[PDB]
Amino acid sequence: LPVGQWPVLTGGAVSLHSAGVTLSTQFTDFVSLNSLRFRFRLAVEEPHFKLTRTRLDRLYGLPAADPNNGKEYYEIAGRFSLISLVPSNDDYQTPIA
Amino acid sequence: WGPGEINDSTTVGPLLDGPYQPTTFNPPVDYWMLLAPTTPGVIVEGTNNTDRWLATILIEPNVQSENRTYTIFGIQEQLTVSNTSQDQWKFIDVVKTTANGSIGQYGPLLSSPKLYAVMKHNEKLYTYEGQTPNATTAHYSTTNYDSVNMTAFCDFYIIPRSEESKCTEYINNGLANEDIVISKTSLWKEMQYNRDITIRFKFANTIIKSGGLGYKWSEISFKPANYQYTYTRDGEEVTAHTTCSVNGMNDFSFNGGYLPTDFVVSKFEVIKENSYVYIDYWDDSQAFRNVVYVRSLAANLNSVMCTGGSYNFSLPVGQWPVLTGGAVSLHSAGVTLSTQFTDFVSLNSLRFRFRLAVEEPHFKLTRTRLDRLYGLPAADPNNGKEYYEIAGRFSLISLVPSNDDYQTPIANSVTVRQDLERQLGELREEFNALSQEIAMSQLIDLALLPLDMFSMFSGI
Amino acid sequence: ANEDIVISKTSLWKEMQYNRDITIRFKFANTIIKSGGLGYKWSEISFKPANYQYTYTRDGEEVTAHTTCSVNGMNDFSFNGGYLPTDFVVSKFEVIKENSYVYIDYWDDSQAFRNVVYVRSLAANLNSVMCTGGSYNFSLPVGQWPVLTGGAVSLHSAGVTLSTQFTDFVSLNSLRFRFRLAVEEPHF
Amino acid sequence: WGPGEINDSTTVGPLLDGPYQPTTFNPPVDYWMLLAPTTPGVIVEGTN
């Protein structure tokens, strides 16, 4: 703040969980992409948000303060299963794209 | 927030000296001795006693050729009396090597304000010669140059060599009814806090000397002293920018004489119960930050014996006196929170009052005429020692603004989890069990009836 | 030590502005403390906290402010035609200068001045009115007295201070109206 | 309301007013002249 003590927007905790998937179409700086769309639901997590020197405590969710939290990224390690069709005039000569 | 306003005057006349009652002196190093000529005649007799027997003699204008009796060194001698003007006074400089040596007349010296300076630099005596405003410092140079003792008959001023320019000037010319809701209401609540505060305070002074020979001292005064210290508040060192002063002190005056060889203390400080020590911390701590709109405060502290030491004084002639004995004591007293307003904001000033009670011994000053002196000195309140330390508790009862639990989503809560649906197996067993009480006739009747989607679920 | 205790439960407050204009006026008074001499040797010349009680129609509302004025912050001077009891000796004379600070204390039973406990904000629109030096004539054991002439001063906002003295459960209520005083010609 | 306890100093003036250098000064009426001599010889001459 231009004067006085600065507030702290501290905390922030959530969890992302899997609830299905479909297909979508992202965009590249130059091209289109056959992109996959993973849709996720949320869950609150114990460590509260606190709004210091100010009138709110006992909040849960994700604030927009620093969602990167210095964490250069977040990761989800899992498996994905695709049953795809491919056009062949016979039982061989299978394409690759 | 931050140290508030403690109004203070300025040191008055730190380098200014004035008339000196006639006493035997010499031009002090880098200090012109201005004169106050009173009557026509020998004004100043500055003798080297070896080769310089100067006798500067005042001469009235309109007289340019006479033979007059001049009292030089106590002897009446017939001297040629003249002027180089009909409006200015001539100062014929009579130089001799004895009490009646060769009367050497020097000049001319025409000064309308009749002011001149005497000094001696680089083993050479500076004597003004010529007519004002162009009195050039001619040089008298004889063995033992800087040994001119001037026996005085007029009043003498001391002016530094650097202020010689001013000397030249003195040589040249002389000296409605509305109220409307702003914000909707808000809930507040009252809470008291407890803080075992430590107090480590070394109080600083502004010892400053006025003119003379270091013997004159303008303002030997304390000041708002700032430090920063670390106090294990709750076992937790909170840092405090510390500011200190005292107000209400008894302002006295010391006077040993009017010459440049006896004390002239412009304003000395003596303490009684007319004063309070005013003190403040500048920490940044939640319970502190709640100082806003306090209900009350209790500075429950232990009394402290505060004693001071002495100052050592710059005396180019002989040593300087010293203080002996004396004490005062401090007691935590009524807290005073002042709220300064800058156009949208309030500067904090938590002026803390400590009452002072003087106590034995007496503050005895060697080589003095005044008896029964009290009060800690501005000379050396710390004796070179360290800050006074006090461990005492403090109560902080205040009306905090704090929304306890409300004004929040009534669904906002850490979500308890689901209930795990009853497993297949016991489900199988229990449905197999229910087969017992089945009637037949009713079963066939029901089985003839056709149900439907709506008639599937609208019975549970 | 390390303990925190709540005293009272829920309670209500609301924010209120007041934009109300009130005239002010001033005279003063000087403590002429002589020394042990004839009178020419002036020990000290200070100000006596000037206390009156004035009463003013505030939009058809006559309210009496008990007024106490004081001055803190100043540059001091001294003058000495000598240090003997017949030529004039001023060991100290305060000369009003730009660094001069003034405290004004209003005492009002008025609901407004009643209302003022926990100030959220407080400002005062205070113009610079032309006040020059007086014409005081001195009192001496022999002969005549000097005379004062000239020296003007204008008024400037130096802030406002609310102050609470918690000696005990008794709450001494002082409000200090701070004033800077810039200097303008004529010369004094 | 009424107590304003800010007087940043207390003012005291002398009455004995310290020593003097020798000058032809008489005791004013109700102003004693105390003679502190530091040299032998004549101290006071009442001249009329």
Residues of B in contact with C176 (CB under 8 A): 338
Residues of A in contact with B286 (CB under 8 A): 53
Q: What string of H, E and C letters represents the secondary structure of B8-38?
A: CCCCCCCCCCCCCCCCCECCCCCEEEEEECC
Handedness of CA B283, B284, B288, B293 (dihedral sign): positive
What is the DSSP secondary-structure string of B68-99?
A: EEEEETTEEEEEEE--S-SSSEEEEEEE-SSS
Going by C-alpha positions, the residue among B402, B406, B405, B408 that lies closest to residue B189 is B402
Residue A44 exposed, middle or buried by CB count within 10 Å (0-12, 13-18, 19+): middle
Residues of D in contact with C31 (CB under 8 A): 11
| Tokens read off for C133 | 């030096």
| Tokens read off for B5 | 């306003």
Q: Which residue has the tokens 């604030």?
A: A63
Q: C 80-119 residues with CB below 8 A of D?
A: 84-85, 91, 103, 105, 107-108, 113
Beta carbons of B275 and D10 less than 8 Å apart: yes
Q: Which residues pair with A40 in a beta bridge?
A: A18
Q: Closest-CA residue in chain C for B333?
A: C167
Q: Cα–Cα distance between C83 and B155 in angstroms, integer?
A: 12
Q: Cα–Cα distance between D12 and B231 in angstroms, integer?
A: 39
Q: Cα–Cα distance between A38 and A18 in angstroms, integer?
A: 8
What contacts B308, CB < 8 A, 6 or more positions away? B323, B326, B376, B377, B379, B380, B381, B382, B383
- Is B243 in CB contact (< 8 Å) with chain C? no
| Residue B169 φ/ψ, nearest 5 degrees | -55, -50
Q: B 353-382 residues with CB below 8 A of C?
A: none
Under 8 Å between Cβ of C91 and C42: yes
Q: Cα–Cα distance between B5 and D10 in angstroms, integer?
A: 18
Omega prior to B37 cis, within 30 of 0: no
CA diameter of chain B: 170
Q: Which residues pair with C57 in a beta bridge?
A: C62
- Is B391 in CB contact (< 8 Å) with chain C? no
Q: Which residue has the tokens 């639901």?
A: A41
Q: D 3-22 residues with CB below 8 A of B?
A: 6-14, 16-22
**How many residues does the structure list for chain B?**
460
SS3 assignment, position C70? strand
Technique of determination: cryo-EM
Q: Which residues pair with C90 in a beta bridge?
A: C42, C79
Beta carbons of B250 and D8 less than 8 Å apart: no
What contacts B288, CB < 8 A, 6 or more positions away? B238, B281
Q: Cα–Cα distance between B210 and C91 in angstroms, integer?
A: 13
| Tokens read off for D30 | 């109700």
Q: Closest-CA residue in chain C for B196?
A: C1
Q: Cα–Cα distance between B45 and B49 in angstroms, integer?
A: 11
